[PDB]
mmCIF file of C-alpha atoms and ligand atoms in Angstrom:
data_model
loop_
_atom_site.group_PDB
_atom_site.id
_atom_site.type_symbol
_atom_site.label_atom_id
_atom_site.label_comp_id
_atom_site.label_asym_id
_atom_site.label_seq_id
_atom_site.Cartn_x
_atom_site.Cartn_y
_atom_site.Cartn_z
ATOM 1 C CA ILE A 181 0.000 0.000 0.000
ATOM 2 C CA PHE A 182 1.125 3.600 -0.498
ATOM 3 C CA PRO A 183 2.442 5.247 2.729
ATOM 4 C CA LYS A 184 -0.361 5.585 5.299
ATOM 5 C CA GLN A 185 -3.548 3.549 4.845
ATOM 6 C CA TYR A 186 -6.971 4.853 3.841
ATOM 7 C CA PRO A 187 -9.968 3.509 5.858
ATOM 8 C CA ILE A 188 -12.405 1.353 3.868
ATOM 9 C CA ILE A 189 -16.150 0.905 4.448
ATOM 10 C CA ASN A 190 -17.923 -1.934 2.628
ATOM 11 C CA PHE A 191 -21.530 -2.208 1.445
ATOM 12 C CA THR A 192 -23.469 -4.606 -0.788
ATOM 13 C CA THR A 193 -26.784 -4.464 -2.639
ATOM 14 C CA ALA A 194 -27.168 -8.256 -2.362
ATOM 15 C CA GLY A 195 -28.700 -8.596 1.090
ATOM 16 C CA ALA A 196 -29.536 -4.902 1.342
ATOM 17 C CA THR A 197 -31.797 -4.203 4.302
ATOM 18 C CA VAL A 198 -32.687 -1.031 6.207
ATOM 19 C CA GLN A 199 -30.320 -2.170 8.970
ATOM 20 C CA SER A 200 -27.289 -2.749 6.731
ATOM 21 C CA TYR A 201 -27.857 0.569 4.952
ATOM 22 C CA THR A 202 -28.274 2.537 8.188
ATOM 23 C CA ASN A 203 -25.106 0.957 9.611
ATOM 24 C CA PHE A 204 -23.266 1.816 6.394
ATOM 25 C CA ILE A 205 -24.331 5.473 6.352
ATOM 26 C CA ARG A 206 -23.685 6.001 10.067
ATOM 27 C CA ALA A 207 -20.305 4.281 9.687
ATOM 28 C CA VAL A 208 -19.313 6.771 6.985
ATOM 29 C CA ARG A 209 -20.409 9.677 9.191
ATOM 30 C CA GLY A 210 -18.557 8.202 12.155
ATOM 31 C CA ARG A 211 -15.316 8.050 10.192
ATOM 32 C CA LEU A 212 -15.618 11.435 8.452
ATOM 33 C CA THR A 213 -15.866 13.221 11.799
ATOM 34 C CA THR A 214 -12.226 12.854 12.883
ATOM 35 C CA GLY A 215 -13.192 13.976 16.388
ATOM 36 C CA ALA A 216 -14.269 17.249 17.985
ATOM 37 C CA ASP A 217 -15.123 20.738 16.659
ATOM 38 C CA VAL A 218 -18.887 21.239 16.390
ATOM 39 C CA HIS A 219 -24.066 24.435 18.400
ATOM 40 C CA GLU A 220 -25.056 20.780 17.944
ATOM 41 C CA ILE A 221 -23.946 19.776 14.430
ATOM 42 C CA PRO A 222 -20.690 17.874 13.656
ATOM 43 C CA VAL A 223 -18.211 19.775 11.485
ATOM 44 C CA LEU A 224 -15.940 18.353 8.781
ATOM 45 C CA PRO A 225 -12.111 18.735 8.929
ATOM 46 C CA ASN A 226 -10.507 21.919 7.589
ATOM 47 C CA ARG A 227 -8.880 21.367 4.189
ATOM 48 C CA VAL A 228 -6.412 24.229 4.782
ATOM 49 C CA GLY A 229 -4.138 22.039 6.894
ATOM 50 C CA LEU A 230 -5.468 18.495 6.677
ATOM 51 C CA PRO A 231 -2.749 15.806 6.331
ATOM 52 C CA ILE A 232 -2.852 13.610 3.213
ATOM 53 C CA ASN A 233 -2.959 10.459 5.373
ATOM 54 C CA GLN A 234 -6.285 11.669 6.807
ATOM 55 C CA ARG A 235 -7.762 13.215 3.648
ATOM 56 C CA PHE A 236 -9.768 10.344 2.138
ATOM 57 C CA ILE A 237 -12.221 7.579 3.036
ATOM 58 C CA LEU A 238 -12.691 4.559 0.759
ATOM 59 C CA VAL A 239 -16.112 2.966 0.249
ATOM 60 C CA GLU A 240 -16.240 -0.450 -1.411
ATOM 61 C CA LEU A 241 -19.574 -1.050 -3.129
ATOM 62 C CA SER A 242 -20.329 -4.703 -3.865
ATOM 63 C CA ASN A 243 -23.042 -5.743 -6.314
ATOM 64 C CA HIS A 244 -25.391 -8.764 -6.361
ATOM 65 C CA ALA A 245 -23.181 -10.119 -9.174
ATOM 66 C CA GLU A 246 -19.919 -9.618 -7.254
ATOM 67 C CA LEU A 247 -18.934 -6.387 -9.009
ATOM 68 C CA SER A 248 -16.882 -4.187 -6.688
ATOM 69 C CA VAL A 249 -16.337 -0.440 -7.100
ATOM 70 C CA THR A 250 -14.076 1.543 -4.765
ATOM 71 C CA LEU A 251 -15.355 5.102 -4.323
ATOM 72 C CA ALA A 252 -12.992 7.671 -2.821
ATOM 73 C CA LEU A 253 -14.699 10.311 -0.688
ATOM 74 C CA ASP A 254 -13.067 13.567 0.390
ATOM 75 C CA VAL A 255 -13.244 13.663 4.202
ATOM 76 C CA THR A 256 -13.648 17.468 4.203
ATOM 77 C CA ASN A 257 -16.842 17.554 2.123
ATOM 78 C CA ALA A 258 -17.966 13.906 1.930
ATOM 79 C CA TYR A 259 -18.166 14.241 -1.866
ATOM 80 C CA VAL A 260 -16.940 11.663 -4.381
ATOM 81 C CA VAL A 261 -13.571 12.592 -5.897
ATOM 82 C CA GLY A 262 -13.089 9.482 -8.021
ATOM 83 C CA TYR A 263 -13.333 5.690 -8.150
ATOM 84 C CA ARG A 264 -11.396 2.545 -9.027
ATOM 85 C CA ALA A 265 -12.756 -0.236 -11.233
ATOM 86 C CA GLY A 266 -10.711 -3.289 -12.132
ATOM 87 C CA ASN A 267 -7.249 -1.954 -12.933
ATOM 88 C CA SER A 268 -8.226 1.646 -13.677
ATOM 89 C CA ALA A 269 -8.958 4.811 -11.709
ATOM 90 C CA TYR A 270 -11.216 7.671 -12.814
ATOM 91 C CA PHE A 271 -11.243 11.035 -11.049
ATOM 92 C CA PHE A 272 -13.399 14.133 -11.469
ATOM 93 C CA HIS A 273 -11.442 17.100 -12.835
ATOM 94 C CA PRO A 274 -9.591 18.714 -9.892
ATOM 95 C CA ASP A 275 -11.268 22.107 -9.470
ATOM 96 C CA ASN A 276 -8.195 23.258 -7.543
ATOM 97 C CA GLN A 277 -4.499 22.588 -8.220
ATOM 98 C CA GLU A 278 -3.904 21.721 -4.547
ATOM 99 C CA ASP A 279 -6.558 18.983 -4.697
ATOM 100 C CA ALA A 280 -4.572 17.432 -7.550
ATOM 101 C CA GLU A 281 -1.643 17.096 -5.138
ATOM 102 C CA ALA A 282 -3.987 15.093 -2.899
ATOM 103 C CA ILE A 283 -5.577 12.937 -5.623
ATOM 104 C CA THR A 284 -2.135 11.647 -6.638
ATOM 105 C CA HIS A 285 -2.040 9.636 -3.377
ATOM 106 C CA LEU A 286 -5.149 7.579 -4.146
ATOM 107 C CA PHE A 287 -5.236 4.469 -6.370
ATOM 108 C CA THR A 288 -1.506 4.648 -7.133
ATOM 109 C CA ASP A 289 -1.151 0.879 -7.557
ATOM 110 C CA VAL A 290 -3.540 0.740 -10.535
ATOM 111 C CA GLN A 291 -2.227 0.232 -14.061
ATOM 112 C CA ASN A 292 -4.453 2.798 -15.768
ATOM 113 C CA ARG A 293 -5.278 6.210 -14.294
ATOM 114 C CA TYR A 294 -7.582 8.729 -15.962
ATOM 115 C CA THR A 295 -9.012 12.155 -15.182
ATOM 116 C CA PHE A 296 -12.239 13.524 -16.638
ATOM 117 C CA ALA A 297 -12.369 16.969 -18.218
ATOM 118 C CA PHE A 298 -15.593 17.673 -16.311
ATOM 119 C CA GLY A 299 -16.011 18.165 -12.570
ATOM 120 C CA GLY A 300 -18.256 16.367 -10.109
ATOM 121 C CA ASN A 301 -20.898 19.095 -9.817
ATOM 122 C CA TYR A 302 -24.503 17.989 -10.384
ATOM 123 C CA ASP A 303 -25.068 20.715 -12.979
ATOM 124 C CA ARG A 304 -22.309 19.189 -15.119
ATOM 125 C CA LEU A 305 -23.242 15.528 -14.598
ATOM 126 C CA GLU A 306 -26.869 16.334 -15.414
ATOM 127 C CA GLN A 307 -25.860 17.914 -18.721
ATOM 128 C CA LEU A 308 -23.785 14.846 -19.613
ATOM 129 C CA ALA A 309 -26.607 12.490 -18.637
ATOM 130 C CA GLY A 310 -29.260 14.752 -20.131
ATOM 131 C CA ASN A 311 -31.309 14.163 -16.998
ATOM 132 C CA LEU A 312 -32.259 16.279 -13.983
ATOM 133 C CA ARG A 313 -32.001 14.900 -10.441
ATOM 134 C CA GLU A 314 -35.800 15.049 -10.287
ATOM 135 C CA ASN A 315 -36.016 12.326 -12.961
ATOM 136 C CA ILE A 316 -33.293 9.872 -11.994
ATOM 137 C CA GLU A 317 -34.851 7.210 -9.770
ATOM 138 C CA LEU A 318 -33.090 6.390 -6.503
ATOM 139 C CA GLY A 319 -33.193 3.263 -4.360
ATOM 140 C CA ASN A 320 -31.324 -0.021 -3.887
ATOM 141 C CA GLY A 321 -32.069 -1.108 -7.447
ATOM 142 C CA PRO A 322 -30.663 2.064 -9.099
ATOM 143 C CA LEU A 323 -27.553 1.808 -6.904
ATOM 144 C CA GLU A 324 -27.156 -1.842 -7.933
ATOM 145 C CA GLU A 325 -27.395 -0.722 -11.561
ATOM 146 C CA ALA A 326 -25.015 2.190 -10.949
ATOM 147 C CA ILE A 327 -22.285 -0.120 -9.637
ATOM 148 C CA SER A 328 -22.425 -2.137 -12.857
ATOM 149 C CA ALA A 329 -22.294 0.943 -15.098
ATOM 150 C CA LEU A 330 -19.242 2.291 -13.259
ATOM 151 C CA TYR A 331 -17.577 -1.130 -13.424
ATOM 152 C CA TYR A 332 -17.960 -1.956 -17.125
ATOM 153 C CA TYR A 333 -16.932 1.616 -17.939
ATOM 154 C CA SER A 334 -13.306 0.487 -17.631
ATOM 155 C CA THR A 335 -13.765 -2.193 -20.311
ATOM 156 C CA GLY A 336 -15.983 -0.755 -23.027
ATOM 157 C CA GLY A 337 -19.555 -0.728 -21.735
ATOM 158 C CA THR A 338 -18.818 2.937 -21.105
ATOM 159 C CA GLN A 339 -21.662 5.033 -22.592
ATOM 160 C CA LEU A 340 -21.049 8.467 -21.064
ATOM 161 C CA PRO A 341 -24.710 9.387 -20.328
ATOM 162 C CA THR A 342 -25.099 6.158 -18.325
ATOM 163 C CA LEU A 343 -21.812 6.765 -16.499
ATOM 164 C CA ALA A 344 -22.944 10.283 -15.561
ATOM 165 C CA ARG A 345 -26.392 9.148 -14.378
ATOM 166 C CA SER A 346 -24.829 6.436 -12.199
ATOM 167 C CA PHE A 347 -22.685 9.039 -10.431
ATOM 168 C CA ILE A 348 -25.707 11.167 -9.518
ATOM 169 C CA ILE A 349 -27.245 8.056 -7.932
ATOM 170 C CA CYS A 350 -24.166 7.129 -5.874
ATOM 171 C CA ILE A 351 -23.467 10.686 -4.708
ATOM 172 C CA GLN A 352 -27.022 11.206 -3.449
ATOM 173 C CA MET A 353 -27.364 7.797 -1.793
ATOM 174 C CA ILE A 354 -23.932 8.056 -0.151
ATOM 175 C CA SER A 355 -22.618 11.625 0.121
ATOM 176 C CA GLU A 356 -25.966 13.391 0.531
ATOM 177 C CA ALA A 357 -27.446 10.578 2.631
ATOM 178 C CA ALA A 358 -24.545 10.994 5.065
ATOM 179 C CA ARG A 359 -24.854 14.788 5.003
ATOM 180 C CA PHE A 360 -28.524 14.926 6.039
ATOM 181 C CA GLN A 361 -30.599 12.596 8.230
ATOM 182 C CA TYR A 362 -33.559 13.603 6.064
ATOM 183 C CA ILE A 363 -31.996 12.229 2.873
ATOM 184 C CA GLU A 364 -30.766 9.107 4.686
ATOM 185 C CA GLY A 365 -34.358 8.449 5.678
ATOM 186 C CA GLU A 366 -35.581 9.039 2.125
ATOM 187 C CA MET A 367 -33.249 6.316 0.863
ATOM 188 C CA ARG A 368 -34.107 4.060 3.814
ATOM 189 C CA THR A 369 -37.866 4.301 3.228
ATOM 190 C CA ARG A 370 -37.353 3.400 -0.441
ATOM 191 C CA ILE A 371 -35.481 0.251 0.605
ATOM 192 C CA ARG A 372 -38.143 -0.373 3.268
ATOM 193 C CA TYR A 373 -40.690 -0.662 0.448
ATOM 194 C CA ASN A 374 -38.441 -1.955 -2.371
ATOM 195 C CA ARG A 375 -39.355 1.062 -4.510
ATOM 196 C CA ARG A 376 -37.678 3.390 -7.009
ATOM 197 C CA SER A 377 -38.493 7.093 -7.138
ATOM 198 C CA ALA A 378 -36.979 10.408 -8.194
ATOM 199 C CA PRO A 379 -36.214 12.890 -5.363
ATOM 200 C CA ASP A 380 -38.758 15.658 -4.803
ATOM 201 C CA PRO A 381 -38.101 19.417 -4.190
ATOM 202 C CA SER A 382 -37.510 18.941 -0.447
ATOM 203 C CA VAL A 383 -34.499 16.708 -1.122
ATOM 204 C CA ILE A 384 -33.056 18.760 -3.999
ATOM 205 C CA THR A 385 -33.353 22.072 -2.127
ATOM 206 C CA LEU A 386 -31.445 20.648 0.848
ATOM 207 C CA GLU A 387 -28.661 19.379 -1.419
ATOM 208 C CA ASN A 388 -28.389 22.715 -3.232
ATOM 209 C CA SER A 389 -28.372 24.493 0.124
ATOM 210 C CA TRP A 390 -25.885 22.302 2.031
ATOM 211 C CA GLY A 391 -23.074 24.841 1.759
ATOM 212 C CA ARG A 392 -25.469 27.719 2.413
ATOM 213 C CA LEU A 393 -26.754 26.002 5.570
ATOM 214 C CA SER A 394 -23.297 25.073 6.862
ATOM 215 C CA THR A 395 -22.275 28.726 6.519
ATOM 216 C CA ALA A 396 -25.403 30.238 8.101
ATOM 217 C CA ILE A 397 -25.438 27.794 11.030
ATOM 218 C CA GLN A 398 -21.712 28.291 11.680
ATOM 219 C CA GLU A 399 -22.186 32.069 11.465
ATOM 220 C CA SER A 400 -25.417 32.201 13.475
ATOM 221 C CA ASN A 401 -25.322 35.335 15.636
ATOM 222 C CA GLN A 402 -25.208 33.447 18.960
ATOM 223 C CA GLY A 403 -28.199 31.355 18.063
ATOM 224 C CA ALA A 404 -30.223 33.073 15.340
ATOM 225 C CA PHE A 405 -29.312 33.207 11.645
ATOM 226 C CA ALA A 406 -28.098 36.372 9.917
ATOM 227 C CA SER A 407 -31.044 36.205 7.530
ATOM 228 C CA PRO A 408 -33.751 33.523 7.185
ATOM 229 C CA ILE A 409 -33.215 30.774 4.611
ATOM 230 C CA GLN A 410 -36.086 29.518 2.455
ATOM 231 C CA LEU A 411 -36.353 25.766 1.887
ATOM 232 C CA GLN A 412 -38.945 23.731 -0.021
ATOM 233 C CA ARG A 413 -41.593 21.315 1.239
ATOM 234 C CA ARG A 414 -42.476 18.072 -0.549
ATOM 235 C CA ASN A 415 -45.211 19.756 -2.610
ATOM 236 C CA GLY A 416 -42.751 22.430 -3.710
ATOM 237 C CA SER A 417 -43.978 25.188 -1.391
ATOM 238 C CA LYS A 418 -41.405 27.337 0.401
ATOM 239 C CA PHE A 419 -40.911 28.174 4.079
ATOM 240 C CA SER A 420 -38.443 30.240 6.115
ATOM 241 C CA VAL A 421 -35.910 28.968 8.660
ATOM 242 C CA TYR A 422 -34.554 31.183 11.454
ATOM 243 C CA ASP A 423 -32.893 28.836 13.957
ATOM 244 C CA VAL A 424 -30.676 25.742 13.905
ATOM 245 C CA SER A 425 -33.002 23.831 16.253
ATOM 246 C CA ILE A 426 -35.564 22.836 13.614
ATOM 247 C CA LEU A 427 -32.612 21.722 11.464
ATOM 248 C CA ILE A 428 -31.004 19.474 14.110
ATOM 249 C CA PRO A 429 -32.834 16.273 13.081
ATOM 250 C CA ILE A 430 -32.472 17.296 9.416
ATOM 251 C CA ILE A 431 -28.767 18.036 8.890
ATOM 252 C CA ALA A 432 -25.972 15.715 10.032
ATOM 253 C CA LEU A 433 -22.670 17.168 8.823
ATOM 254 C CA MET A 434 -21.326 20.605 7.904
ATOM 255 C CA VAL A 435 -18.194 21.725 6.065
ATOM 256 C CA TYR A 436 -15.730 23.933 7.992
ATOM 257 C CA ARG A 437 -16.362 27.636 7.387
ATOM 258 C CA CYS A 438 -14.997 30.211 9.850
ATOM 259 C CA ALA A 439 -13.273 30.889 13.177
ATOM 260 C CA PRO A 440 -14.293 28.275 15.782
ATOM 261 C CA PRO A 441 -16.344 29.298 18.856
ATOM 262 C CA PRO A 442 -14.207 30.884 21.644
ATOM 263 C CA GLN A 443 -13.592 21.936 23.760
ATOM 264 C CA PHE A 444 -11.973 23.099 26.999
HETATM 265 N N1 DDP B 146 -22.792 19.751 -6.721
HETATM 266 C C1 DDP B 146 -21.624 19.632 -5.953
HETATM 267 N N2 DDP B 146 -20.429 19.402 -6.553
HETATM 268 C C2 DDP B 146 -19.283 19.282 -5.839
HETATM 269 O O1 DDP B 146 -18.273 19.077 -6.457
HETATM 270 C C3 DDP B 146 -19.330 19.396 -4.444
HETATM 271 N N3 DDP B 146 -18.134 19.266 -3.718
HETATM 272 C C4 DDP B 146 -20.577 19.636 -3.838
HETATM 273 O O2 DDP B 146 -20.685 19.761 -2.455
HETATM 274 N N4 DDP B 146 -21.685 19.746 -4.611
#
Protein backbone atom coordinates (compact mmCIF):
# COMPACT_ATOMS: atom_id res chain seq x y z
CA ILE A 1 0.00 0.00 0.00
CA PHE A 2 1.13 3.60 -0.50
CA PRO A 3 2.44 5.25 2.73
CA LYS A 4 -0.36 5.59 5.30
CA GLN A 5 -3.55 3.55 4.84
CA TYR A 6 -6.97 4.85 3.84
CA PRO A 7 -9.97 3.51 5.86
CA ILE A 8 -12.40 1.35 3.87
CA ILE A 9 -16.15 0.91 4.45
CA ASN A 10 -17.92 -1.93 2.63
CA PHE A 11 -21.53 -2.21 1.44
CA THR A 12 -23.47 -4.61 -0.79
CA THR A 13 -26.78 -4.46 -2.64
CA ALA A 14 -27.17 -8.26 -2.36
CA GLY A 15 -28.70 -8.60 1.09
CA ALA A 16 -29.54 -4.90 1.34
CA THR A 17 -31.80 -4.20 4.30
CA VAL A 18 -32.69 -1.03 6.21
CA GLN A 19 -30.32 -2.17 8.97
CA SER A 20 -27.29 -2.75 6.73
CA TYR A 21 -27.86 0.57 4.95
CA THR A 22 -28.27 2.54 8.19
CA ASN A 23 -25.11 0.96 9.61
CA PHE A 24 -23.27 1.82 6.39
CA ILE A 25 -24.33 5.47 6.35
CA ARG A 26 -23.69 6.00 10.07
CA ALA A 27 -20.31 4.28 9.69
CA VAL A 28 -19.31 6.77 6.98
CA ARG A 29 -20.41 9.68 9.19
CA GLY A 30 -18.56 8.20 12.15
CA ARG A 31 -15.32 8.05 10.19
CA LEU A 32 -15.62 11.44 8.45
CA THR A 33 -15.87 13.22 11.80
CA THR A 34 -12.23 12.85 12.88
CA GLY A 35 -13.19 13.98 16.39
CA ALA A 36 -14.27 17.25 17.98
CA ASP A 37 -15.12 20.74 16.66
CA VAL A 38 -18.89 21.24 16.39
CA HIS A 39 -24.07 24.43 18.40
CA GLU A 40 -25.06 20.78 17.94
CA ILE A 41 -23.95 19.78 14.43
CA PRO A 42 -20.69 17.87 13.66
CA VAL A 43 -18.21 19.78 11.48
CA LEU A 44 -15.94 18.35 8.78
CA PRO A 45 -12.11 18.73 8.93
CA ASN A 46 -10.51 21.92 7.59
CA ARG A 47 -8.88 21.37 4.19
CA VAL A 48 -6.41 24.23 4.78
CA GLY A 49 -4.14 22.04 6.89
CA LEU A 50 -5.47 18.50 6.68
CA PRO A 51 -2.75 15.81 6.33
CA ILE A 52 -2.85 13.61 3.21
CA ASN A 53 -2.96 10.46 5.37
CA GLN A 54 -6.29 11.67 6.81
CA ARG A 55 -7.76 13.21 3.65
CA PHE A 56 -9.77 10.34 2.14
CA ILE A 57 -12.22 7.58 3.04
CA LEU A 58 -12.69 4.56 0.76
CA VAL A 59 -16.11 2.97 0.25
CA GLU A 60 -16.24 -0.45 -1.41
CA LEU A 61 -19.57 -1.05 -3.13
CA SER A 62 -20.33 -4.70 -3.86
CA ASN A 63 -23.04 -5.74 -6.31
CA HIS A 64 -25.39 -8.76 -6.36
CA ALA A 65 -23.18 -10.12 -9.17
CA GLU A 66 -19.92 -9.62 -7.25
CA LEU A 67 -18.93 -6.39 -9.01
CA SER A 68 -16.88 -4.19 -6.69
CA VAL A 69 -16.34 -0.44 -7.10
CA THR A 70 -14.08 1.54 -4.76
CA LEU A 71 -15.35 5.10 -4.32
CA ALA A 72 -12.99 7.67 -2.82
CA LEU A 73 -14.70 10.31 -0.69
CA ASP A 74 -13.07 13.57 0.39
CA VAL A 75 -13.24 13.66 4.20
CA THR A 76 -13.65 17.47 4.20
CA ASN A 77 -16.84 17.55 2.12
CA ALA A 78 -17.97 13.91 1.93
CA TYR A 79 -18.17 14.24 -1.87
CA VAL A 80 -16.94 11.66 -4.38
CA VAL A 81 -13.57 12.59 -5.90
CA GLY A 82 -13.09 9.48 -8.02
CA TYR A 83 -13.33 5.69 -8.15
CA ARG A 84 -11.40 2.55 -9.03
CA ALA A 85 -12.76 -0.24 -11.23
CA GLY A 86 -10.71 -3.29 -12.13
CA ASN A 87 -7.25 -1.95 -12.93
CA SER A 88 -8.23 1.65 -13.68
CA ALA A 89 -8.96 4.81 -11.71
CA TYR A 90 -11.22 7.67 -12.81
CA PHE A 91 -11.24 11.03 -11.05
CA PHE A 92 -13.40 14.13 -11.47
CA HIS A 93 -11.44 17.10 -12.84
CA PRO A 94 -9.59 18.71 -9.89
CA ASP A 95 -11.27 22.11 -9.47
CA ASN A 96 -8.19 23.26 -7.54
CA GLN A 97 -4.50 22.59 -8.22
CA GLU A 98 -3.90 21.72 -4.55
CA ASP A 99 -6.56 18.98 -4.70
CA ALA A 100 -4.57 17.43 -7.55
CA GLU A 101 -1.64 17.10 -5.14
CA ALA A 102 -3.99 15.09 -2.90
CA ILE A 103 -5.58 12.94 -5.62
CA THR A 104 -2.13 11.65 -6.64
CA HIS A 105 -2.04 9.64 -3.38
CA LEU A 106 -5.15 7.58 -4.15
CA PHE A 107 -5.24 4.47 -6.37
CA THR A 108 -1.51 4.65 -7.13
CA ASP A 109 -1.15 0.88 -7.56
CA VAL A 110 -3.54 0.74 -10.53
CA GLN A 111 -2.23 0.23 -14.06
CA ASN A 112 -4.45 2.80 -15.77
CA ARG A 113 -5.28 6.21 -14.29
CA TYR A 114 -7.58 8.73 -15.96
CA THR A 115 -9.01 12.15 -15.18
CA PHE A 116 -12.24 13.52 -16.64
CA ALA A 117 -12.37 16.97 -18.22
CA PHE A 118 -15.59 17.67 -16.31
CA GLY A 119 -16.01 18.16 -12.57
CA GLY A 120 -18.26 16.37 -10.11
CA ASN A 121 -20.90 19.10 -9.82
CA TYR A 122 -24.50 17.99 -10.38
CA ASP A 123 -25.07 20.71 -12.98
CA ARG A 124 -22.31 19.19 -15.12
CA LEU A 125 -23.24 15.53 -14.60
CA GLU A 126 -26.87 16.33 -15.41
CA GLN A 127 -25.86 17.91 -18.72
CA LEU A 128 -23.78 14.85 -19.61
CA ALA A 129 -26.61 12.49 -18.64
CA GLY A 130 -29.26 14.75 -20.13
CA ASN A 131 -31.31 14.16 -17.00
CA LEU A 132 -32.26 16.28 -13.98
CA ARG A 133 -32.00 14.90 -10.44
CA GLU A 134 -35.80 15.05 -10.29
CA ASN A 135 -36.02 12.33 -12.96
CA ILE A 136 -33.29 9.87 -11.99
CA GLU A 137 -34.85 7.21 -9.77
CA LEU A 138 -33.09 6.39 -6.50
CA GLY A 139 -33.19 3.26 -4.36
CA ASN A 140 -31.32 -0.02 -3.89
CA GLY A 141 -32.07 -1.11 -7.45
CA PRO A 142 -30.66 2.06 -9.10
CA LEU A 143 -27.55 1.81 -6.90
CA GLU A 144 -27.16 -1.84 -7.93
CA GLU A 145 -27.39 -0.72 -11.56
CA ALA A 146 -25.02 2.19 -10.95
CA ILE A 147 -22.29 -0.12 -9.64
CA SER A 148 -22.43 -2.14 -12.86
CA ALA A 149 -22.29 0.94 -15.10
CA LEU A 150 -19.24 2.29 -13.26
CA TYR A 151 -17.58 -1.13 -13.42
CA TYR A 152 -17.96 -1.96 -17.12
CA TYR A 153 -16.93 1.62 -17.94
CA SER A 154 -13.31 0.49 -17.63
CA THR A 155 -13.77 -2.19 -20.31
CA GLY A 156 -15.98 -0.75 -23.03
CA GLY A 157 -19.55 -0.73 -21.74
CA THR A 158 -18.82 2.94 -21.11
CA GLN A 159 -21.66 5.03 -22.59
CA LEU A 160 -21.05 8.47 -21.06
CA PRO A 161 -24.71 9.39 -20.33
CA THR A 162 -25.10 6.16 -18.32
CA LEU A 163 -21.81 6.76 -16.50
CA ALA A 164 -22.94 10.28 -15.56
CA ARG A 165 -26.39 9.15 -14.38
CA SER A 166 -24.83 6.44 -12.20
CA PHE A 167 -22.68 9.04 -10.43
CA ILE A 168 -25.71 11.17 -9.52
CA ILE A 169 -27.25 8.06 -7.93
CA CYS A 170 -24.17 7.13 -5.87
CA ILE A 171 -23.47 10.69 -4.71
CA GLN A 172 -27.02 11.21 -3.45
CA MET A 173 -27.36 7.80 -1.79
CA ILE A 174 -23.93 8.06 -0.15
CA SER A 175 -22.62 11.63 0.12
CA GLU A 176 -25.97 13.39 0.53
CA ALA A 177 -27.45 10.58 2.63
CA ALA A 178 -24.55 10.99 5.07
CA ARG A 179 -24.85 14.79 5.00
CA PHE A 180 -28.52 14.93 6.04
CA GLN A 181 -30.60 12.60 8.23
CA TYR A 182 -33.56 13.60 6.06
CA ILE A 183 -32.00 12.23 2.87
CA GLU A 184 -30.77 9.11 4.69
CA GLY A 185 -34.36 8.45 5.68
CA GLU A 186 -35.58 9.04 2.13
CA MET A 187 -33.25 6.32 0.86
CA ARG A 188 -34.11 4.06 3.81
CA THR A 189 -37.87 4.30 3.23
CA ARG A 190 -37.35 3.40 -0.44
CA ILE A 191 -35.48 0.25 0.60
CA ARG A 192 -38.14 -0.37 3.27
CA TYR A 193 -40.69 -0.66 0.45
CA ASN A 194 -38.44 -1.95 -2.37
CA ARG A 195 -39.36 1.06 -4.51
CA ARG A 196 -37.68 3.39 -7.01
CA SER A 197 -38.49 7.09 -7.14
CA ALA A 198 -36.98 10.41 -8.19
CA PRO A 199 -36.21 12.89 -5.36
CA ASP A 200 -38.76 15.66 -4.80
CA PRO A 201 -38.10 19.42 -4.19
CA SER A 202 -37.51 18.94 -0.45
CA VAL A 203 -34.50 16.71 -1.12
CA ILE A 204 -33.06 18.76 -4.00
CA THR A 205 -33.35 22.07 -2.13
CA LEU A 206 -31.44 20.65 0.85
CA GLU A 207 -28.66 19.38 -1.42
CA ASN A 208 -28.39 22.72 -3.23
CA SER A 209 -28.37 24.49 0.12
CA TRP A 210 -25.88 22.30 2.03
CA GLY A 211 -23.07 24.84 1.76
CA ARG A 212 -25.47 27.72 2.41
CA LEU A 213 -26.75 26.00 5.57
CA SER A 214 -23.30 25.07 6.86
CA THR A 215 -22.27 28.73 6.52
CA ALA A 216 -25.40 30.24 8.10
CA ILE A 217 -25.44 27.79 11.03
CA GLN A 218 -21.71 28.29 11.68
CA GLU A 219 -22.19 32.07 11.46
CA SER A 220 -25.42 32.20 13.47
CA ASN A 221 -25.32 35.34 15.64
CA GLN A 222 -25.21 33.45 18.96
CA GLY A 223 -28.20 31.35 18.06
CA ALA A 224 -30.22 33.07 15.34
CA PHE A 225 -29.31 33.21 11.64
CA ALA A 226 -28.10 36.37 9.92
CA SER A 227 -31.04 36.20 7.53
CA PRO A 228 -33.75 33.52 7.18
CA ILE A 229 -33.22 30.77 4.61
CA GLN A 230 -36.09 29.52 2.46
CA LEU A 231 -36.35 25.77 1.89
CA GLN A 232 -38.94 23.73 -0.02
CA ARG A 233 -41.59 21.31 1.24
CA ARG A 234 -42.48 18.07 -0.55
CA ASN A 235 -45.21 19.76 -2.61
CA GLY A 236 -42.75 22.43 -3.71
CA SER A 237 -43.98 25.19 -1.39
CA LYS A 238 -41.40 27.34 0.40
CA PHE A 239 -40.91 28.17 4.08
CA SER A 240 -38.44 30.24 6.12
CA VAL A 241 -35.91 28.97 8.66
CA TYR A 242 -34.55 31.18 11.45
CA ASP A 243 -32.89 28.84 13.96
CA VAL A 244 -30.68 25.74 13.90
CA SER A 245 -33.00 23.83 16.25
CA ILE A 246 -35.56 22.84 13.61
CA LEU A 247 -32.61 21.72 11.46
CA ILE A 248 -31.00 19.47 14.11
CA PRO A 249 -32.83 16.27 13.08
CA ILE A 250 -32.47 17.30 9.42
CA ILE A 251 -28.77 18.04 8.89
CA ALA A 252 -25.97 15.72 10.03
CA LEU A 253 -22.67 17.17 8.82
CA MET A 254 -21.33 20.60 7.90
CA VAL A 255 -18.19 21.73 6.07
CA TYR A 256 -15.73 23.93 7.99
CA ARG A 257 -16.36 27.64 7.39
CA CYS A 258 -15.00 30.21 9.85
CA ALA A 259 -13.27 30.89 13.18
CA PRO A 260 -14.29 28.27 15.78
CA PRO A 261 -16.34 29.30 18.86
CA PRO A 262 -14.21 30.88 21.64
CA GLN A 263 -13.59 21.94 23.76
CA PHE A 264 -11.97 23.10 27.00
N1 LIG B 1 -22.79 19.75 -6.72
C1 LIG B 1 -21.62 19.63 -5.95
N2 LIG B 1 -20.43 19.40 -6.55
C2 LIG B 1 -19.28 19.28 -5.84
O1 LIG B 1 -18.27 19.08 -6.46
C3 LIG B 1 -19.33 19.40 -4.44
N3 LIG B 1 -18.13 19.27 -3.72
C4 LIG B 1 -20.58 19.64 -3.84
O2 LIG B 1 -20.69 19.76 -2.46
N4 LIG B 1 -21.69 19.75 -4.61
